[PDB]
């Protein structure tokens, strides 16, 4: 399931910080950076356990990402979201991980923050 992220400030340097809130992952010609999409299309993504390299007729999300949840109950950071594509039967995009915690209330589109990162 794909979701569009919202609540982002508008203004080569790419940032993904939250003080101003940014999450730059445009399509171009704390281990926040996970992988890249190129384009059939090529997907190179480093998930929490394995590096996955696949070439498929991917139907990528308009705003693809991975997500790590923080559980205050055990102070454990665990990967819970993989929202890169809906299907997998010259341009590229960077895949960044989001952080979600008790400090980030809201829904799938707004209930998030980001660890310091740049590229």
């Amino acid at each position: 399931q794909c979701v569009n992220l919202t609540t982002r400030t508008q203004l080569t340097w790419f940032h993904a910080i939250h003080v101003t809130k940014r999450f730059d992952n445009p399509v171009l010609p704390s281990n926040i950076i996970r992988g890249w999409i190129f384009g059939q299309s090529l997907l190179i993504v480093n998930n929490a356990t394995n590096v996955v390299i696949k070439v498929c007729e991917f139907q990528f999300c308009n705003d693809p990402f991975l997500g790590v949840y923080y559980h205050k109950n055990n102070k454990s950071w665990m990967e819970s979201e993989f929202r890169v594509y809906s299907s997998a039967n010259t341009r590229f995009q960077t895949l960044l991980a989001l952080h979600r915690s008790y400090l980030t209330p809201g829904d799938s589109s707004s209930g998030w923050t980001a660890g310091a990162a740049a590229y």
Partner: antibody
Amino acid sequence: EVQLVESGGGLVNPGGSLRLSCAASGFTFSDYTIHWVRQAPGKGLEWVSSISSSSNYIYYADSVKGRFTISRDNAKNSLSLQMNSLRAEDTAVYYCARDGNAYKWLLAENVRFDYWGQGTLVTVSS
Amino acid sequence: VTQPASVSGSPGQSITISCTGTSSDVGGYNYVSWYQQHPGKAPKLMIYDVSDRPSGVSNRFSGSKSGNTASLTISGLQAEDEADYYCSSYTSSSTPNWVFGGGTKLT
């Protein structure tokens, strides 16, 4: 103190339309999903619709789906519900309620209503 | 979602209000909540996530669930408790929605 104040109730004819709205205070409006629930006189509660904080996730009861439109203005801390082509069957007290689940990204399906407004009566007759 | 039309008992007694649904509503989803509505007033949340209790709610109210039936148990019944108690749950049938039971009148 968390408050929700419904306005825009009143009497309308069948086949007409009515906009309801409620203002929020005491909490961060943009952090919560808000639901509408209606209660016909002498009857129980029926869920009507819900709008997520991002307004990206919107749900309607089948009984109102296709007629009702829900929207929210986060800047003004104001939630609106537009009811078109309404009927006598829609007579009820409408409430807007704050979803107690502040983490809809974890359990979107898990809904509870921590705070309710006073409610406003909508009557459809002539 | 089915509930008793009404329940009653002497003050000081424990009254159990049942809420029977199906596997798609109560059985497979521990999202059951209970609301107390006083005449002329908006309903208050008493129990959520089957058994959890919101702050500000007395400890006489406790929820439980077994099979496809959820229950609200009210200990130390007070005269103050007279109200209509509604059972709410998430139903995954067809298009996702949320429902309420008929509502149990407690006297």
